[PDB]
Write an enzyme that holds these catalytic residues in place. Structure first.
Site, mmCIF file in Angstrom:
data_model
loop_
_atom_site.group_PDB
_atom_site.id
_atom_site.type_symbol
_atom_site.label_atom_id
_atom_site.label_comp_id
_atom_site.label_asym_id
_atom_site.label_seq_id
_atom_site.Cartn_x
_atom_site.Cartn_y
_atom_site.Cartn_z
ATOM 1 N N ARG A 82 0.658 -1.245 -0.012
ATOM 2 C CA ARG A 82 -0.135 -0.071 -0.090
ATOM 3 C C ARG A 82 0.866 1.063 0.194
ATOM 4 O O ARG A 82 1.222 1.760 -0.940
ATOM 5 C CB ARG A 82 -0.921 0.045 1.396
ATOM 6 C CG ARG A 82 -1.653 1.245 1.526
ATOM 7 C CD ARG A 82 -1.939 2.000 0.268
ATOM 8 N NE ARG A 82 -2.506 3.528 0.710
ATOM 9 C CZ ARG A 82 -1.738 4.378 1.415
ATOM 10 N NH1 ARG A 82 -0.651 3.988 2.033
ATOM 11 N NH2 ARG A 82 -2.350 5.546 1.743
ATOM 12 N N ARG A 92 -1.771 -3.462 7.361
ATOM 13 C CA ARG A 92 -0.757 -3.412 6.224
ATOM 14 C C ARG A 92 0.583 -3.161 6.993
ATOM 15 O O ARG A 92 0.756 -3.472 7.818
ATOM 16 C CB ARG A 92 -1.196 -2.282 5.212
ATOM 17 C CG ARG A 92 -2.267 -2.655 4.357
ATOM 18 C CD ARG A 92 -3.107 -1.629 3.950
ATOM 19 N NE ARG A 92 -4.084 -1.173 5.124
ATOM 20 C CZ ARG A 92 -3.545 -0.296 6.020
ATOM 21 N NH1 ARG A 92 -2.250 0.095 6.116
ATOM 22 N NH2 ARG A 92 -4.541 0.171 6.995
ATOM 23 N N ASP A 95 6.841 -4.863 9.123
ATOM 24 C CA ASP A 95 7.662 -4.488 10.333
ATOM 25 C C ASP A 95 8.714 -5.563 11.074
ATOM 26 O O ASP A 95 8.208 -6.502 11.596
ATOM 27 C CB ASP A 95 6.787 -4.254 11.740
ATOM 28 C CG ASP A 95 7.168 -3.510 13.098
ATOM 29 O OD1 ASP A 95 7.951 -2.651 12.910
ATOM 30 O OD2 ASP A 95 6.978 -4.347 13.972
ATOM 31 N N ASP A 97 12.333 -6.375 12.581
ATOM 32 C CA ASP A 97 13.574 -6.032 13.371
ATOM 33 C C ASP A 97 14.625 -6.789 13.312
ATOM 34 O O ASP A 97 14.287 -8.166 12.851
ATOM 35 C CB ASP A 97 13.097 -5.675 14.620
ATOM 36 C CG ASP A 97 11.870 -4.426 14.705
ATOM 37 O OD1 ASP A 97 10.980 -4.644 14.112
ATOM 38 O OD2 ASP A 97 12.244 -3.328 15.465
#
EC number: 2.7.6.3
Length: 158
Positions: A82, A92, A95, A97
């Site tokens: 998006r 959406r 993420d 790490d």
């Protein structure tokens, strides 16, 4: 060096979101995917209220610290999932790490082998625990065993 980038993503069809990172993370300037699996679901509880998600642990041999690593990963997430304008709303986006970085000791901001918030994050340690349940060393404790006594014990495979 073997690093860990636990990818998150959610929203109706997180398959596309996840793939965003899989793209860059797939063939990074000097990195290369090694182990990636354990797809499951995680409850929002906070950022949203729509249960779904699709998390999966990843561990590729990156030559560039998570500093550059994350840049490329979220780069796609910044112009793929998006993100017509920062994913617009809550759902959406991606993420991912860095949990470890060669098992050595190096903490900063974008990189932290000991890795914080892990204990209270059974939806990141458990997956990689499947692709490699011998990391531990980083802080002296594995991944699932930390969440097993802190977070959960074993989430459902989506």
């Amino acid at each position: 060096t073997v690093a860990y980038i636990a990818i998150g993503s959610n929203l109706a069809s997180p398959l596309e979101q996840v793939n965003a990172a899989l793209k860059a993370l797939g063939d990074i300037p000097e990195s290369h995917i090694l182990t990636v699996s354990s797809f499951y679901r995680t409850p929002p509880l906070g950022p949203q209220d729509q249960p779904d998600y699709l998390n999966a642990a990843v561990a590729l041999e990156t030559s560039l610290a998570p500093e550059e690593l994350l840049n490329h990963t979220q780069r796609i997430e910044l112009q793929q999932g998006r993100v017509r304008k920062a994913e617009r709303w809550g759902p959406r986006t991606l993420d991912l790490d860095i949990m470890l970085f060669g098992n050595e000791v190096i903490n900063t901001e974008r990189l932290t082998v000991p890795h914080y918030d892990m204990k209270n994050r059974g939806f990141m340690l458990w997956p990689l625990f499947e692709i490699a349940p011998e990391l531990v060393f980083p802080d002296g404790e594995m991944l699932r065993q930390i969440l097993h006594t802190r977070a959960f014990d074993k989430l459902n495979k989506w």
